[PDB]
Design a protein around this motif. Structure first.
Motif, mmCIF file in Angstrom:
data_model
loop_
_atom_site.group_PDB
_atom_site.id
_atom_site.type_symbol
_atom_site.label_atom_id
_atom_site.label_comp_id
_atom_site.label_asym_id
_atom_site.label_seq_id
_atom_site.Cartn_x
_atom_site.Cartn_y
_atom_site.Cartn_z
ATOM 1 N N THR A 204 -12.257 59.017 15.898
ATOM 2 C CA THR A 204 -11.607 58.645 17.150
ATOM 3 C C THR A 204 -10.862 57.323 16.987
ATOM 4 N N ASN A 205 -11.511 56.357 16.347
ATOM 5 C CA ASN A 205 -10.926 55.038 16.101
ATOM 6 C C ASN A 205 -10.481 54.893 14.651
ATOM 7 N N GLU A 206 -9.784 55.905 14.127
ATOM 8 C CA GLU A 206 -9.314 55.832 12.748
ATOM 9 C C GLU A 206 -8.390 54.641 12.534
ATOM 10 N N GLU A 207 -7.623 54.261 13.559
ATOM 11 C CA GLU A 207 -6.703 53.139 13.409
ATOM 12 C C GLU A 207 -7.449 51.857 13.060
ATOM 13 N N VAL B 6 -8.733 47.796 9.130
ATOM 14 C CA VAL B 6 -9.766 46.973 8.510
ATOM 15 C C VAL B 6 -9.753 47.156 6.998
ATOM 16 N N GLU B 7 -9.709 48.408 6.538
ATOM 17 C CA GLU B 7 -9.727 48.664 5.102
ATOM 18 C C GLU B 7 -8.525 48.033 4.412
ATOM 19 N N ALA B 8 -7.353 48.080 5.050
ATOM 20 C CA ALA B 8 -6.159 47.513 4.431
ATOM 21 C C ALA B 8 -6.189 45.991 4.438
ATOM 22 N N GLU B 9 -6.772 45.381 5.472
ATOM 23 C CA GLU B 9 -6.913 43.928 5.471
ATOM 24 C C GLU B 9 -7.877 43.477 4.381
ATOM 25 N N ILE B 10 -9.006 44.173 4.236
ATOM 26 C CA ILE B 10 -9.965 43.824 3.193
ATOM 27 C C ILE B 10 -9.374 44.099 1.818
#
Length: 107
Positions: A1-4, A9-13
């Protein structure tokens, strides 16, 4: 639901770890001394490093806000959980103090 959220988060990390992938961070050795370690020594798939970093308390939140991460703390947590060399080299007690200090410094 909150894939965004999970994608941002994954791209920032991923961005912050890639940027500092080779940087030598300082960790307490069992001889009261200091030893150096970077993400490149983890010998882990790049995706797995980011997956583990997401388990560090307070990181996923900092990544949601786009703030600078305590990467020495992230590297120490990931290595302590995954690297036998790191475990056998580090003083776990002072490490947790440093990680708690740098995780309270950040937030």
């Amino acid at each position: 639901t909150n894939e965004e959220d999970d994608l941002s988060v994954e791209a920032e990390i991923a961005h912050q770890i890639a940027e500092s992938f080779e940087k030598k961070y300082k960790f307490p050795s069992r001889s009261s001394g200091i030893f150096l370690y970077n993400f490149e020594q983890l010998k882990m798939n790049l995706d797995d490093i980011v997956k583990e970093a997401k388990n560090v308390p307070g990181v996923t939140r900092l990544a949601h806000d786009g703030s600078k991460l305590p990467l020495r703390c992230v590297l120490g947590w990931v290595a302590l959980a995954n690297s036998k060399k790191f475990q056998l080299l580090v003083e776990a007690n002072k490490l947790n103090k440093i990680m708690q200090d740098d995780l309270n410094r950040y937030a």
